[PDB]
Amino acid sequence: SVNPYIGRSPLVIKSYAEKLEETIAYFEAQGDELNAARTRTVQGIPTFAWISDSATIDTIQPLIADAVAHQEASGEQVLVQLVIYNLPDRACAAKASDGEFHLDDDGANKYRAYVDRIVAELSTADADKLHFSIVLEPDSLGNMVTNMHVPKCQGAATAYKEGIAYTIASLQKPNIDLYIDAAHGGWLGWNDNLRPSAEIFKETLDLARQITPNATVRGLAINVSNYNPYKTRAREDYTEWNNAYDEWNYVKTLTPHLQAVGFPAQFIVDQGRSGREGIRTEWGQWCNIRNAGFGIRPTTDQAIVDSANVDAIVWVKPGGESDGTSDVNAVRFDENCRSPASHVPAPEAGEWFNEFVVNLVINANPPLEPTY
Numbered sequence: 001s002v003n004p005y006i007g008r009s010p011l012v013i014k015s016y017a018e019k020l021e022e023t024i025a026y027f028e029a030q031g032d033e034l035n036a037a038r039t040r041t042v043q044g045i046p047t048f049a050w051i052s053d054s055a056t057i058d059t060i061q062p063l064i065a066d067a068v069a070h071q072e073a074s075g076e077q078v079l080v081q082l083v084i085y086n087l088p089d090r091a092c093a094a095k096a097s098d099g100e101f102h103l104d105d106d107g108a109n110k111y112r113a114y115v116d117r118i119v120a121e122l123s124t125a126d127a128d129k130l131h132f133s134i135v136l137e138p139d140s141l142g143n144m145v146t147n148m149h150v151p152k153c154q155g156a157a158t159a160y161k162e163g164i165a166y167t168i169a170s171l172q173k174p175n176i177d178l179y180i181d182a183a184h185g186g187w188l189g190w191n192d193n194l195r196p197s198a199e200i201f202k203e204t205l206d207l208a209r210q211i212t213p214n215a216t217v218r219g220l221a222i223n224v225s226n227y228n229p230y231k232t233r234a235r236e237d238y239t240e241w242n243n244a245y246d247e248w249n250y251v252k253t254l255t256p257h258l259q260a261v262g263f264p265a266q267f268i269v270d271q272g273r274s275g276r277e278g279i280r281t282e283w284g285q286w287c288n289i290r291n292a293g294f295g296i297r298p299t300t301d302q303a304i305v306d307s308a309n310v311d312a313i314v315w316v317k318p319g320g321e322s323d324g325t326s327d328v329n330a331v332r333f334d335e336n337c338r339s340p341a342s343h344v345p346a347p348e349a350g351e352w353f354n355e356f357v358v359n360l361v362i363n364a365n366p367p368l369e370p371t372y
Ligand SMILES: OC[C@H]1O[C@@H](O)[C@H](O)[C@@H](O)[C@@H]1O
Pocket: 050, 052, 096, 097, 225, 317, 318, 321, 322, 323, 349, 350, 351
Protein backbone atom coordinates (compact mmCIF):
# COMPACT_ATOMS: atom_id res chain seq x y z
CA SER A 1 0.00 0.00 0.00
CA VAL A 2 1.49 3.31 -1.16
CA ASN A 3 0.16 6.90 -1.21
CA PRO A 4 -1.62 7.08 -4.60
CA TYR A 5 -1.13 10.87 -4.70
CA ILE A 6 2.65 10.60 -5.02
CA GLY A 7 3.84 10.89 -8.63
CA ARG A 8 0.35 11.59 -10.01
CA SER A 9 -1.68 14.58 -11.18
CA PRO A 10 -5.27 14.53 -9.89
CA LEU A 11 -7.80 15.01 -12.71
CA VAL A 12 -9.56 18.31 -13.30
CA ILE A 13 -13.28 17.60 -13.76
CA LYS A 14 -14.36 19.32 -16.98
CA SER A 15 -18.08 19.30 -16.13
CA TYR A 16 -17.33 21.21 -12.92
CA ALA A 17 -15.13 23.73 -14.75
CA GLU A 18 -18.05 24.25 -17.13
CA LYS A 19 -20.49 25.03 -14.30
CA LEU A 20 -18.03 27.71 -13.13
CA GLU A 21 -18.60 29.59 -16.39
CA GLU A 22 -21.77 30.93 -14.79
CA THR A 23 -19.71 32.27 -11.89
CA ILE A 24 -17.19 33.88 -14.24
CA ALA A 25 -20.09 35.48 -16.13
CA TYR A 26 -21.52 36.90 -12.90
CA PHE A 27 -18.19 38.50 -11.97
CA GLU A 28 -17.73 39.89 -15.49
CA ALA A 29 -21.26 41.41 -15.33
CA GLN A 30 -20.33 43.16 -12.05
CA GLY A 31 -17.14 44.48 -13.73
CA ASP A 32 -15.18 42.40 -11.22
CA GLU A 33 -12.27 41.26 -13.37
CA LEU A 34 -10.15 40.11 -10.43
CA ASN A 35 -12.75 37.68 -9.13
CA ALA A 36 -13.65 36.51 -12.63
CA ALA A 37 -9.96 35.67 -13.13
CA ARG A 38 -9.82 33.95 -9.73
CA THR A 39 -12.78 31.83 -10.79
CA ARG A 40 -10.81 30.86 -13.91
CA THR A 41 -8.06 29.62 -11.54
CA VAL A 42 -10.64 27.42 -9.77
CA GLN A 43 -11.53 25.81 -13.13
CA GLY A 44 -8.03 24.30 -13.13
CA ILE A 45 -8.10 22.90 -9.56
CA PRO A 46 -8.76 19.13 -9.31
CA THR A 47 -11.95 18.00 -7.55
CA PHE A 48 -13.80 14.72 -7.01
CA ALA A 49 -16.48 13.60 -9.45
CA TRP A 50 -19.49 12.25 -7.52
CA ILE A 51 -21.36 9.21 -8.78
CA SER A 52 -24.44 10.25 -6.82
CA ASP A 53 -27.04 8.38 -8.88
CA SER A 54 -27.34 5.68 -11.53
CA ALA A 55 -27.46 8.13 -14.45
CA THR A 56 -24.09 9.56 -13.41
CA ILE A 57 -22.49 6.15 -14.04
CA ASP A 58 -22.72 7.17 -17.72
CA THR A 59 -20.16 9.94 -17.12
CA ILE A 60 -17.42 7.55 -15.98
CA GLN A 61 -16.27 6.31 -19.38
CA PRO A 62 -16.23 9.82 -20.93
CA LEU A 63 -14.17 10.94 -17.91
CA ILE A 64 -11.79 8.00 -18.39
CA ALA A 65 -11.40 8.80 -22.10
CA ASP A 66 -10.69 12.44 -21.21
CA ALA A 67 -8.13 11.37 -18.61
CA VAL A 68 -6.36 8.92 -20.95
CA ALA A 69 -6.14 11.67 -23.59
CA HIS A 70 -4.67 14.11 -21.05
CA GLN A 71 -2.23 11.50 -19.72
CA GLU A 72 -0.92 10.67 -23.19
CA ALA A 73 -0.58 14.34 -24.24
CA SER A 74 1.03 15.60 -21.02
CA GLY A 75 3.05 12.52 -20.03
CA GLU A 76 1.68 12.90 -16.49
CA GLN A 77 0.12 9.94 -14.65
CA VAL A 78 -3.45 11.06 -13.92
CA LEU A 79 -5.32 10.24 -10.71
CA VAL A 80 -9.08 10.10 -11.28
CA GLN A 81 -10.94 11.04 -8.08
CA LEU A 82 -14.47 9.61 -7.67
CA VAL A 83 -17.06 9.44 -4.92
CA ILE A 84 -19.45 6.51 -4.66
CA TYR A 85 -22.54 7.99 -3.03
CA ASN A 86 -25.79 6.07 -3.50
CA LEU A 87 -26.56 3.87 -0.49
CA PRO A 88 -30.20 2.90 -0.06
CA ASP A 89 -31.94 5.16 2.50
CA ARG A 90 -28.99 7.52 1.96
CA ALA A 91 -28.07 10.27 4.47
CA CYS A 92 -30.51 8.77 6.97
CA ALA A 93 -30.38 11.50 9.63
CA ALA A 94 -31.28 14.31 7.28
CA LYS A 95 -33.74 14.87 4.43
CA ALA A 96 -31.64 17.07 2.13
CA SER A 97 -29.71 14.33 0.41
CA ASP A 98 -32.13 11.41 0.22
CA GLY A 99 -31.26 9.41 -2.91
CA GLU A 100 -33.00 7.22 -5.45
CA PHE A 101 -32.71 3.89 -3.61
CA HIS A 102 -34.92 3.03 -0.66
CA LEU A 103 -34.86 -0.10 1.48
CA ASP A 104 -38.67 -0.47 1.18
CA ASP A 105 -38.33 -0.56 -2.63
CA ASP A 106 -35.67 -3.25 -3.26
CA GLY A 107 -32.94 -0.71 -2.48
CA ALA A 108 -30.26 -3.14 -1.29
CA ASN A 109 -30.38 -5.18 -4.52
CA LYS A 110 -30.56 -2.00 -6.59
CA TYR A 111 -27.45 -0.70 -4.83
CA ARG A 112 -25.56 -3.91 -5.63
CA ALA A 113 -26.48 -3.58 -9.33
CA TYR A 114 -25.38 0.08 -9.29
CA VAL A 115 -22.00 -1.03 -7.84
CA ASP A 116 -21.72 -3.79 -10.48
CA ARG A 117 -22.22 -1.16 -13.20
CA ILE A 118 -19.48 1.03 -11.76
CA VAL A 119 -17.09 -1.93 -11.50
CA ALA A 120 -17.63 -2.73 -15.20
CA GLU A 121 -16.89 0.88 -16.17
CA LEU A 122 -13.71 0.72 -14.10
CA SER A 123 -12.66 -2.54 -15.79
CA THR A 124 -12.22 -1.33 -19.40
CA ALA A 125 -8.89 -1.25 -21.28
CA ASP A 126 -8.82 2.55 -20.87
CA ALA A 127 -9.59 2.28 -17.12
CA ASP A 128 -6.63 -0.08 -16.87
CA LYS A 129 -4.33 2.75 -18.06
CA LEU A 130 -5.39 4.98 -15.16
CA HIS A 131 -5.27 5.11 -11.37
CA PHE A 132 -8.30 5.91 -9.20
CA SER A 133 -8.80 7.47 -5.77
CA ILE A 134 -12.32 6.61 -4.58
CA VAL A 135 -14.14 7.96 -1.54
CA LEU A 136 -16.81 5.54 -0.30
CA GLU A 137 -20.20 6.77 0.85
CA PRO A 138 -19.98 10.10 2.71
CA ASP A 139 -22.46 10.59 5.59
CA SER A 140 -23.03 6.87 6.14
CA LEU A 141 -21.34 4.98 8.98
CA GLY A 142 -21.10 8.04 11.23
CA ASN A 143 -24.86 7.70 11.57
CA MET A 144 -24.48 4.28 13.19
CA VAL A 145 -22.24 5.82 15.84
CA THR A 146 -24.44 8.77 16.93
CA ASN A 147 -27.79 8.66 15.12
CA MET A 148 -29.28 5.24 15.95
CA HIS A 149 -32.14 7.09 17.71
CA VAL A 150 -33.28 8.23 14.25
CA PRO A 151 -35.66 5.52 12.93
CA LYS A 152 -34.37 5.71 9.33
CA CYS A 153 -30.78 5.22 10.59
CA GLN A 154 -31.66 2.30 12.88
CA GLY A 155 -33.37 0.72 9.85
CA ALA A 156 -30.47 1.36 7.50
CA ALA A 157 -27.53 0.32 9.72
CA THR A 158 -27.19 -3.19 8.31
CA ALA A 159 -27.67 -1.97 4.74
CA TYR A 160 -24.96 0.69 5.14
CA LYS A 161 -22.41 -1.79 6.47
CA GLU A 162 -23.31 -4.46 3.91
CA GLY A 163 -23.45 -1.92 1.06
CA ILE A 164 -20.05 -0.39 1.76
CA ALA A 165 -18.61 -3.90 2.28
CA TYR A 166 -19.88 -4.95 -1.15
CA THR A 167 -18.37 -1.82 -2.69
CA ILE A 168 -14.99 -2.44 -1.02
CA ALA A 169 -15.08 -6.13 -2.02
CA SER A 170 -15.91 -5.20 -5.64
CA LEU A 171 -13.11 -2.66 -6.14
CA GLN A 172 -9.97 -4.60 -5.30
CA LYS A 173 -7.73 -3.72 -8.25
CA PRO A 174 -4.04 -2.72 -8.29
CA ASN A 175 -4.98 0.62 -9.88
CA ILE A 176 -7.65 1.64 -7.32
CA ASP A 177 -7.18 3.14 -3.85
CA LEU A 178 -10.20 3.26 -1.57
CA TYR A 179 -10.95 5.68 1.26
CA ILE A 180 -13.91 5.04 3.59
CA ASP A 181 -15.69 8.21 4.66
CA ALA A 182 -15.06 9.04 8.31
CA ALA A 183 -17.07 12.23 8.81
CA HIS A 184 -15.27 15.13 10.53
CA GLY A 185 -13.81 16.03 13.93
CA GLY A 186 -17.00 17.69 15.19
CA TRP A 187 -18.99 14.51 14.61
CA LEU A 188 -16.78 11.47 15.32
CA GLY A 189 -13.81 13.14 17.09
CA TRP A 190 -15.48 13.48 20.51
CA ASN A 191 -13.71 11.11 22.90
CA ASP A 192 -16.66 8.73 23.28
CA ASN A 193 -17.15 8.38 19.52
CA LEU A 194 -13.57 7.44 18.63
CA ARG A 195 -13.63 3.73 19.55
CA PRO A 196 -17.05 2.91 18.06
CA SER A 197 -16.03 4.74 14.88
CA ALA A 198 -12.82 2.75 14.55
CA GLU A 199 -14.76 -0.44 15.31
CA ILE A 200 -17.43 0.13 12.66
CA PHE A 201 -14.78 0.87 10.01
CA LYS A 202 -13.06 -2.39 10.90
CA GLU A 203 -16.37 -4.28 11.04
CA THR A 204 -17.17 -3.03 7.55
CA LEU A 205 -13.73 -3.98 6.20
CA ASP A 206 -14.08 -7.44 7.76
CA LEU A 207 -17.46 -7.89 6.05
CA ALA A 208 -15.77 -6.97 2.77
CA ARG A 209 -13.09 -9.57 3.44
CA GLN A 210 -15.78 -12.24 3.83
CA ILE A 211 -16.79 -11.44 0.22
CA THR A 212 -13.32 -10.88 -1.25
CA PRO A 213 -10.44 -12.48 0.65
CA ASN A 214 -7.64 -10.07 1.55
CA ALA A 215 -9.73 -7.02 0.60
CA THR A 216 -8.14 -3.81 1.78
CA VAL A 217 -8.58 -0.05 1.75
CA ARG A 218 -6.04 2.78 1.75
CA GLY A 219 -7.68 4.55 4.68
CA LEU A 220 -10.24 7.24 5.41
CA ALA A 221 -11.58 10.49 3.99
CA ILE A 222 -12.40 13.25 6.47
CA ASN A 223 -14.19 16.61 6.37
CA VAL A 224 -15.99 15.64 3.13
CA SER A 225 -18.60 18.33 2.41
CA ASN A 226 -17.78 20.06 5.68
CA TYR A 227 -15.95 23.28 6.57
CA ASN A 228 -13.47 22.55 9.34
CA PRO A 229 -10.00 24.06 9.04
CA TYR A 230 -6.96 21.86 8.61
CA LYS A 231 -5.09 23.80 11.29
CA THR A 232 -7.23 26.34 13.13
CA ARG A 233 -6.15 29.96 13.44
CA ALA A 234 -8.67 30.51 16.27
CA ARG A 235 -10.20 27.57 18.15
CA GLU A 236 -14.00 27.97 18.47
CA ASP A 237 -15.83 27.54 21.80
CA TYR A 238 -17.98 24.79 20.30
CA THR A 239 -14.84 22.68 19.91
CA GLU A 240 -13.80 22.81 23.56
CA TRP A 241 -13.40 19.36 25.17
CA ASN A 242 -12.99 17.80 21.68
CA ASN A 243 -9.38 16.92 20.83
CA ALA A 244 -10.33 16.88 17.13
CA TYR A 245 -10.87 20.65 17.02
CA ASP A 246 -9.33 20.94 13.56
CA GLU A 247 -8.87 18.22 10.96
CA TRP A 248 -5.11 17.86 11.50
CA ASN A 249 -5.94 17.18 15.16
CA TYR A 250 -8.76 14.81 14.12
CA VAL A 251 -6.14 12.73 12.28
CA LYS A 252 -3.90 12.71 15.37
CA THR A 253 -6.81 11.86 17.67
CA LEU A 254 -8.38 9.03 15.65
CA THR A 255 -5.16 7.35 14.46
CA PRO A 256 -4.36 5.34 17.62
CA HIS A 257 -7.93 4.03 17.72
CA LEU A 258 -7.61 2.83 14.12
CA GLN A 259 -4.29 1.21 14.95
CA ALA A 260 -5.94 -0.61 17.91
CA VAL A 261 -8.36 -2.40 15.56
CA GLY A 262 -5.87 -3.00 12.73
CA PHE A 263 -7.45 -0.43 10.40
CA PRO A 264 -5.05 1.58 8.17
CA ALA A 265 -4.58 5.14 9.47
CA GLN A 266 -4.00 6.99 6.18
CA PHE A 267 -6.20 9.99 5.37
CA ILE A 268 -7.29 12.36 2.67
CA VAL A 269 -8.77 15.62 3.94
CA ASP A 270 -11.35 17.77 2.15
CA GLN A 271 -10.49 21.50 2.39
CA GLY A 272 -12.61 22.75 -0.51
CA ARG A 273 -14.88 24.88 1.71
CA SER A 274 -12.52 25.43 4.67
CA GLY A 275 -10.88 28.78 3.88
CA ARG A 276 -13.02 30.88 6.23
CA GLU A 277 -13.38 30.00 9.89
CA GLY A 278 -15.91 31.52 12.26
CA ILE A 279 -18.96 31.19 9.98
CA ARG A 280 -20.96 28.81 12.23
CA THR A 281 -22.47 29.25 15.67
CA GLU A 282 -22.77 25.47 16.19
CA TRP A 283 -20.58 22.62 14.96
CA GLY A 284 -23.63 20.71 13.64
CA GLN A 285 -24.48 23.41 11.09
CA TRP A 286 -23.64 21.78 7.75
CA CYS A 287 -26.06 23.09 5.14
CA ASN A 288 -24.86 25.85 2.74
CA ILE A 289 -22.91 27.77 5.38
CA ARG A 290 -22.89 31.44 4.40
CA ASN A 291 -19.53 33.02 3.56
CA ALA A 292 -17.69 29.73 3.25
CA GLY A 293 -14.45 30.18 1.31
CA PHE A 294 -12.32 27.87 -0.83
CA GLY A 295 -9.53 26.50 1.37
CA ILE A 296 -6.02 25.11 1.02
CA ARG A 297 -5.55 23.94 -2.57
CA PRO A 298 -5.07 20.20 -3.20
CA THR A 299 -1.55 19.20 -2.22
CA THR A 300 0.75 16.47 -0.94
CA ASP A 301 3.40 18.99 0.23
CA GLN A 302 4.45 17.95 3.73
CA ALA A 303 5.38 21.58 4.52
CA ILE A 304 1.59 22.11 4.54
CA VAL A 305 0.29 18.61 5.32
CA ASP A 306 2.66 18.08 8.29
CA SER A 307 1.62 14.44 8.85
CA ALA A 308 2.87 11.10 7.58
CA ASN A 309 -0.70 9.84 8.16
CA VAL A 310 -2.16 12.28 5.60
CA ASP A 311 -1.84 11.28 1.93
CA ALA A 312 -3.20 14.57 0.59
CA ILE A 313 -5.38 17.59 1.12
CA VAL A 314 -8.05 17.35 -1.59
CA TRP A 315 -11.29 19.03 -2.69
CA VAL A 316 -14.04 16.43 -2.45
CA LYS A 317 -17.31 18.37 -2.22
CA PRO A 318 -17.39 20.64 -5.29
CA GLY A 319 -18.05 24.19 -4.16
CA GLY A 320 -21.17 25.62 -5.76
CA GLU A 321 -23.10 22.35 -5.67
CA SER A 322 -25.80 22.88 -3.04
CA ASP A 323 -26.01 20.94 0.25
CA GLY A 324 -29.80 21.07 0.16
CA THR A 325 -32.85 23.11 -0.67
CA SER A 326 -34.20 25.89 1.55
CA ASP A 327 -37.65 25.49 -0.13
CA VAL A 328 -39.87 24.57 2.83
CA ASN A 329 -42.39 22.81 0.56
CA ALA A 330 -39.84 20.37 -0.88
CA VAL A 331 -39.85 16.69 0.05
CA ARG A 332 -36.13 17.00 0.77
CA PHE A 333 -36.37 20.16 2.84
CA ASP A 334 -34.24 19.82 5.94
CA GLU A 335 -34.42 22.40 8.74
CA ASN A 336 -30.60 22.52 8.85
CA CYS A 337 -30.80 24.29 5.48
CA ARG A 338 -32.46 27.23 7.21
CA SER A 339 -30.07 27.36 10.17
CA PRO A 340 -29.02 30.84 11.33
CA ALA A 341 -25.74 30.26 9.46
CA SER A 342 -27.28 29.02 6.20
CA HIS A 343 -27.21 30.83 2.86
CA VAL A 344 -30.85 31.14 1.73
CA PRO A 345 -32.41 30.69 -0.78
CA ALA A 346 -30.63 27.53 -1.94
CA PRO A 347 -31.56 24.93 -4.59
CA GLU A 348 -31.80 21.12 -4.27
CA ALA A 349 -28.74 19.22 -3.05
CA GLY A 350 -26.23 18.87 -5.88
CA GLU A 351 -27.76 21.63 -8.00
CA TRP A 352 -25.81 24.75 -8.90
CA PHE A 353 -25.85 27.57 -6.34
CA ASN A 354 -24.09 30.41 -8.11
CA GLU A 355 -24.28 32.98 -5.28
CA PHE A 356 -22.62 30.48 -2.96
CA VAL A 357 -19.58 29.87 -5.16
CA VAL A 358 -19.33 33.64 -5.79
CA ASN A 359 -18.75 33.80 -2.02
CA LEU A 360 -16.39 30.80 -2.04
CA VAL A 361 -14.14 32.76 -4.42
CA ILE A 362 -14.35 36.05 -2.47
CA ASN A 363 -13.68 34.27 0.86
CA ALA A 364 -10.91 31.96 -0.37
CA ASN A 365 -7.96 31.52 2.01
CA PRO A 366 -5.23 31.65 0.93
CA PRO A 367 -6.66 34.11 -1.61
CA LEU A 368 -6.89 32.73 -5.14
CA GLU A 369 -4.29 33.95 -7.59
CA PRO A 370 -6.12 35.29 -10.67
CA THR A 371 -5.72 33.69 -14.11
CA TYR A 372 -6.34 36.71 -16.35
O1 LIG B 1 -22.22 18.00 -4.60
C1 LIG B 1 -21.81 16.64 -4.41
C2 LIG B 1 -22.97 15.84 -3.85
O2 LIG B 1 -23.35 16.43 -2.59
C3 LIG B 1 -24.43 15.74 -1.97
O3 LIG B 1 -24.74 16.42 -0.75
C4 LIG B 1 -25.66 15.75 -2.87
O4 LIG B 1 -26.68 14.99 -2.22
C5 LIG B 1 -25.36 15.15 -4.25
O5 LIG B 1 -26.50 15.38 -5.10
C6 LIG B 1 -24.13 15.82 -4.85
O6 LIG B 1 -23.71 15.16 -6.06
